[PDB]
Symmetry: C3
Subunit: 600 residues, 3 copies
Amino acid sequence: DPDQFRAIIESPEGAGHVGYQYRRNTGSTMRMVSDVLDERVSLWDFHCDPSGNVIQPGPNVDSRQYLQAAIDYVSSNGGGTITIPAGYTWYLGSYGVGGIAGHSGIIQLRSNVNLNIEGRIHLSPFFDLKPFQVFVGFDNGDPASSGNLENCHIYGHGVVDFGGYEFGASSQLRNGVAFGRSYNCSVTGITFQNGDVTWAITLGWNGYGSNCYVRKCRFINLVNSSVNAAHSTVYVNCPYSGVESCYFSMSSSFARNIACSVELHQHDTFYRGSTVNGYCRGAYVVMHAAEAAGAGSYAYNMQVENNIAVIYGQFVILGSDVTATVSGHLNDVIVSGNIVSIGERAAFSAPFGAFIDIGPDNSGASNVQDIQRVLVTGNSFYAPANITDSAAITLRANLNGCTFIANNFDCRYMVYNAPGTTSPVVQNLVWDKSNVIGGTHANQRAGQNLFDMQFASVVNSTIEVQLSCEDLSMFSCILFPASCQLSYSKITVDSAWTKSMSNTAVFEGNQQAGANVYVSYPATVNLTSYNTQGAVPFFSTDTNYAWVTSAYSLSINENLDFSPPATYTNKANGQLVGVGYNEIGGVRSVSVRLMLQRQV
Amino acid sequence: DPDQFRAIIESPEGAGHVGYQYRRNTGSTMRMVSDVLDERVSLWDFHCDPSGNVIQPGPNVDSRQYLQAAIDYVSSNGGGTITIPAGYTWYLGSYGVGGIAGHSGIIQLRSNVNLNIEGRIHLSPFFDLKPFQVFVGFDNGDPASSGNLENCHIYGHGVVDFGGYEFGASSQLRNGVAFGRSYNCSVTGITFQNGDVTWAITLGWNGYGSNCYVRKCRFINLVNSSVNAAHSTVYVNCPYSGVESCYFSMSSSFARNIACSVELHQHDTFYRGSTVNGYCRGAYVVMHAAEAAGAGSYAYNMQVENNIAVIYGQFVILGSDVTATVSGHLNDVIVSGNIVSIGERAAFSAPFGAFIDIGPDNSGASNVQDIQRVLVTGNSFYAPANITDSAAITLRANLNGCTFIANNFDCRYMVYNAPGTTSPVVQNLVWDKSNVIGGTHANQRAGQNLFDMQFASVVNSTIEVQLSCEDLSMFSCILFPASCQLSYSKITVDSAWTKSMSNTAVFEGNQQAGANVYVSYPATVNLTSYNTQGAVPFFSTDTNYAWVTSAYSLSINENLDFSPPATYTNKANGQLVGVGYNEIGGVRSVSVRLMLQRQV
Amino acid sequence: DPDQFRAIIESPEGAGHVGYQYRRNTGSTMRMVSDVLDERVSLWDFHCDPSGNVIQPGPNVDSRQYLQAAIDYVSSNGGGTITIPAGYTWYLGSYGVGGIAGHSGIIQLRSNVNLNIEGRIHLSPFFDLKPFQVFVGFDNGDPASSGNLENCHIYGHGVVDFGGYEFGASSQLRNGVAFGRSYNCSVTGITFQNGDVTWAITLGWNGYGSNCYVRKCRFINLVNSSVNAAHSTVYVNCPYSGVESCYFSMSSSFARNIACSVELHQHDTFYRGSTVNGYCRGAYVVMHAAEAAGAGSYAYNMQVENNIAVIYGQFVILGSDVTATVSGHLNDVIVSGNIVSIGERAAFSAPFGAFIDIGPDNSGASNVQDIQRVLVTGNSFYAPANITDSAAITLRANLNGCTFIANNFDCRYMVYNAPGTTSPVVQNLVWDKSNVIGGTHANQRAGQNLFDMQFASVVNSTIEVQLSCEDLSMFSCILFPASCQLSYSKITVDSAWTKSMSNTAVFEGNQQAGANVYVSYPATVNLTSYNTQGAVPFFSTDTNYAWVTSAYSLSINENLDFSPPATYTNKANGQLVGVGYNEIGGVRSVSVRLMLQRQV
Ligand SMILES: CC(=O)N[C@@H]1[C@@H](O[C@H]2O[C@H](CO)[C@H](O[C@H]3O[C@H](CO[C@@H]4O[C@@H](C)[C@H](O)[C@@H](O)[C@H]4O)[C@@H](O)[C@H](O)[C@H]3O)[C@H](O[C@@H]3O[C@H](CO)[C@@H](O)[C@H](O)[C@H]3NC(C)=O)[C@H]2O)[C@H](O)[C@@H](CO)O[C@H]1O
Ligand SMILES: CC(=O)N[C@@H]1[C@@H](O[C@H]2O[C@H](CO)[C@H](O[C@H]3O[C@H](CO[C@@H]4O[C@@H](C)[C@H](O)[C@@H](O)[C@H]4O)[C@@H](O)[C@H](O)[C@H]3O)[C@H](O[C@@H]3O[C@H](CO)[C@@H](O)[C@H](O)[C@H]3NC(C)=O)[C@H]2O)[C@H](O)[C@@H](CO)O[C@H]1O
Ligand SMILES: CC(=O)N[C@@H]1[C@@H](O[C@H]2O[C@H](CO)[C@H](O[C@H]3O[C@H](CO[C@@H]4O[C@@H](C)[C@H](O)[C@@H](O)[C@H]4O)[C@@H](O)[C@H](O)[C@H]3O)[C@H](O[C@@H]3O[C@H](CO)[C@@H](O)[C@H](O)[C@H]3NC(C)=O)[C@H]2O)[C@H](O)[C@@H](CO)O[C@H]1O
Ligand code: NA
Ligand code: NA
Ligand code: NA
Ligand code: NA
Ligand code: NA
Ligand code: NA
């Protein structure tokens, strides 16, 4: 048998016959070399032909079956981490089988089986013009019948490369990682690049899942064709999950019209600390009734914070909707610390530029939403001067509340909705005086209202307009068409930089006269006094001030021989009246800039 | 000796006789296989019986001595990283010995010895009803006599499972990781679950330590019994240390009354980017005089940012206290970007709901604190409408300053302390007008004051109340009992949504008359004029306005034949007086809503 | 040949003859032991003499050539990760050769070759008093002729120790990691310590590079001598790059005058979540025209967020400058969530304390900058009471815009520039009323203006001063010297805590009279009435009020027999005039505190 010894050694069992003890420590386990090598595993351990000879990866080799055999085997031992070695590109060239075939799946992920991707995974041209989802954690073609994927992490310095292939048809779907009904799963460090896909990563399934995250990943050039119907790089569809410290970049013209970086679709989800360039949209924050199975009908505790973006459309898009039996609700959202610009483009050349959009549902309905208790604070937004279609908020569907405090918005509109489109019902819209309104679009606003209140109704709302520079081009600071009801609201226009404006606040239906409307704004008023020497009344010539509770002078008095009143009340006939002083008698006639006040 | 060759090879020294050169590179080191295997180490290298045969882990095997032998040996070589292999559960079934026995220690950590926990560490039922601290970095039973633990990191995808065992007695202590006097130590990635413990992780010891962190960890179901006296998942007791991007969840009813996610107890500490569900409390931020040995008597540079929480009690609890010889101080705190809700519960069913609590000391003393220079900004807080016991701040102990700017608070009270309890001394409480006060509790506030100023005294404080909707249920917006002194303060109530309120600001001791009190609020006032045609005075019927410096009309004038004054001063007898206008003579009698102003 | 078998086995090819199959899986690859060992690589694989015998590291061994041979070889295979083993200190004792010699380079980094530093890398005394850059990613002495460094990550629990050696001459440069023209490079986890260097890490080169990051690193004691000209621990000189969750500490007195933690020099860069102690400065945010080659002439999307600092000079320093052919621009910056203190020091003992500094260029020019669209929000700043030289903003060079909202600034000055120095041109400076002004420096401000507007001109600016306590020591709240033009601006001083101030707002050139200046502030005014019983005019004795549009009483009326007017206008001769009431006749003389208003 010393023949058998040499033979044993050269055989696949040879390492199992060579002894080892850690650092020659006599207190350590007496092991065999194979035991120590068995502590780790790589694709090389499965990337072999039927006789066991290793196969080199490359563009003419389909690595799929080998990677799947590796995952299957490690799963059978309770899990571990498979390395995809550095220094090689591992091509995938066929579809998987079984439960992932209903998802156009390539590789099936398994619980407790982690992938350390150090090398590159590329798609072969077998996938050109076809659907695919590269890594799939469902174990059934019907997600409702799927088991869970748990404790599965994909990480490393490596790369998933989608081969540059365009979509074959708009109806197709393409994904990088679908974790499925996914609990404690994550992707960290990986670069996803060079594709035309629907998503790079999806987390959860209709609210099933928990604790799934995307961290320190890069997503580069993942839309490239006019065939691609839509793209959102990460879709978060389970609670207690999020995206942090990622980098998203697109260069395609199509991406400026179709691509969104993240979608948050379940409660207790976040998007923070990320950088986006070249995209249409930053994030959807939406509660879809259709997605309410696993974690309820409410999206709450939604956080979009500390991101950096250059986009062409809207930064954050809010939504909720209904099905026949389920109603979706969105509340308790915070959008904070973000610095966002609309990139250089012509006006109207991409979807309407906005920091916040209150969007209709997927079928265009604007009367299904239940969105409230949103806080938008400490963000910056800029849009170049030429971009007419830029707003701090485009309010296009019913809104039950949104609060803006201490932002800096430098764009064409503050509040906007297109007239003759939707007529949203608006409650609890709060625009605090601490919102700074920039000057980039000064002189560009002919015909336009800075706050264009194109709504069915506004209730329990606050708009405290404060300019920081002049813009005499604008038609008004805030305008309410006669079709918009206004009640139980506070609307103020600070006088600074308004002395030369002919219109400040405009109420085309006289809505400022409502019983519970609290307003103030500047106006110019012509007055005429009685003749009397001494204390003498001045009265407005016009009679449109029956709503005014007090007014006071914003003008100097160039006269020596008299002074108009400093302050005014009204009279039943709608004149203002106040008591001035004639040092010498005579009828006086003056035109004065006043702060008109109602109940404030 | 070719017999000895075969024998050498099969022996524990065999790998030390098989040559190796990296990738057949002739410029590489001529090594032996054992040298390459010696670059890594796992528990398997020590998990062996006295004859060196490997032992399989499992519920009837106590892995403690093997893990300790591994740590001891790697420490002896200057450190390294021990893997706790994936695919196995490693049970701990006895107490450690030596310096950790005074801490109910199981495993002793050692400097530069890292644990990569990929598999699961479970506690055996030996620990049921007993104290324990699983990993302990002290090397002495008396922490004052302990050496340091340095450069010790615990990380991986694995799990520490506390076996579900309840506490045996309230007085017992249980911990996962006590790093001790810990410098550059960390826990990353690990799931701590299934226990009834006091803490999961503690960092530092009485201010000794530095640069210790908890990142991307999960803490799940760590309270389960009514025996557990108290739980705080991470206790940070060294400077330059913190918690980031963690997940905390509890399901026990007891956790809603006793559990806190983090405690920050030393300067330059942080809690950010984390998600909490099912807990009583978010974070304590406290300078205990008793803990002031290693880093001084001041907790400064304390940061609670960008967290997401559903809790049942208080979000942030501030404190400082004294011993006979040391006085603790808390200053330079920021609480920012947090989104927090009180979970669904009955009123008074858990500790009083609050965003910020200024808590007494551990013995209930409210006159020992030195808390100042705190900034609370850009946070959201919500509590359901039924939860009477919910406040933006419960101010229950002396306060030397706290600043609120640009938050959104939607709960029952803004400022609250219970009457007939403590009478805190309050300085430098600043509530900026940019705090938005939500409407969820509108109509729920019968008998209640929105700002209930139940203090001994208030000085150098600012309360700028701004409503955003009506709540005519409330007794007042702000009330000062006669027992609260008020001086050198600014108190304003914006008129919006207040026209129908009978009380806006209430000063039960006439404190608004103080020399350095600056106030304004709406009131209804009855006036009567003299008969005279022309400019004519109107005087208040009541005489309680000797403190008023000016007042102006918040009401329209329904009359044609006269107008009351737009603006009023006072007279020595406490009447208001202003000059209106009688177009026709006659004594006039009117009831007007005024903005009463003092020194503003 | 069984002689040759034993011989084969003991030779460097021996492991290539011992068979292995993973976990005895018959479906796995039939490999050799050497194949499995070849999956990893360490310095030990190259740290050998010319005959291949391993060399032990230590202070008398220069490890440089071995580490370079390792990097060179792994590069030749397409990359991988080289471990620098734990438990050893690896000394570097000579300069590298080739392309890195022009950079005083020691080690040349190569693309796709990662370093896992678990042990310690120390500099030997060969480097004492000499320049050095430890790791260099340029491949040419001229960076303009360099190739790129891509996909190179340095990470681990290890340490780079600079040996404590002082600089030999101020003109020398020292660096830890210069990634060069660096794309997807990073440093994670590493401690840099014990040095006198210029930088620890630099990212990019003149805008060439992308996606480079520094995360969870520590930088400890990296300045130690008066020879060191300047230090900035991380210099970010490529876009889409940043620093997060790092720790920076200095103990040297020299560091308080010279050291800065980070510099952001290209667009889409960030500095977040970090802690700094012992430094002069927090971060420069600068667009240098000289550095504009690779990513354009604009620094935009610059983020400084959520940091904790104790510094001695300025927190954030803004800049832009020009060369003959290129003009640098800085815009779209956010500074948010930071908590910053000037450490204990004497007044004037370190560079002028500031939260924000608008600094000149490197040659002192203050008329080259183009800095605008900056948002500073939700930060705290404190400086001890004695530190005269402390300001929220030192505005020392031309400024095209900066917006402050909802900060808490507790220091000597709000806005400051030294008189008789630079006279900056100021546009779009916005100080919102929601900035809280602390009280630490109350009583310290004799001779001083809280807002000291020492500028050539101010346009399109807003200063809304709101005190929160009294400081009657100060000369004024805001002062404009006659040399500062003021136009199209809003300047307000809230009356709270101002009743006893003799000066509130001071316009030494009467600038508040400008046509488009909107102001309000308190003043004391002496008035005298006519004799007449009844409605009767009161007129100011002084004639300096021709600019006043309205005024109203901030004083009570102690009289029964008359009342002064509640509100006043002006007259052409610059008197105020209003209508009061004489119940009994007689000339009245009163001194009243008024809110003077112009166009507000
Ligand atoms: C691209 C994108 O994210 N758009 C956002 C809107 O999403 C809706 O439209 C997209 C268009 O791609 C998705 O619908 C497509 O896909 C669904 C789901 O695919 C099936 O189920 C998978 C689990 C399985 O792997 C697949 O093989 C398919 O069987 C398909 O049913 C639709 O017909 C198809 O148009 C998106 O669906 C969700 O996708 C996420 C992520 O994969 C899943 O977790 C959810 O279960 C899907 N939800 C539903 C209700 O089916 C649609 O929700 C989005 O509504 C709006 C507003 O936020 O923004 C767009 O940007
Ligand atoms: C649970 C919690 O964190 N509660 C917070 C309050 O903490 C105080 O009460 C808790 C109750 O558990 C702790 O006191 C218990 O433990 C201490 C410390 O244990 C000893 O020293 C350890 C180093 C050693 O391992 C152990 O074997 C024990 O010898 C004990 O002395 C008390 O009798 C006991 O009730 C907590 O003590 C601190 O614990 C941290 C973390 O372990 C240590 O770093 C500190 O050294 C301990 N501090 C002191 C002064 O001993 C008490 O501080 C807390 O005060 C309030 C306010 O923030 O909030 C509660 O939530
Ligand atoms: C210390 C610091 O960061 N100070 C900040 C100012 O930086 C300027 O001054 C410093 C002083 O050290 C640097 O100038 C020194 O270095 C440059 C660059 O070195 C050469 O090129 C390297 C690529 C190469 O490795 C070296 O061998 C040298 O050949 C040198 O040209 C100067 O003579 C010398 O004084 C700094 O230069 C930049 O350094 C970064 C980081 O290394 C490089 O990426 C840039 O390419 C250099 N930029 C230029 C224009 O050469 C100077 O920019 C800084 O201006 C101000 C304001 O932000 O703040 C100081 O804190
Ligand atoms: Na499908
Ligand atoms: Na309508
Ligand atoms: Na003890
Ligand atoms: Na009292
Ligand atoms: Na050089
Ligand atoms: Na000038």
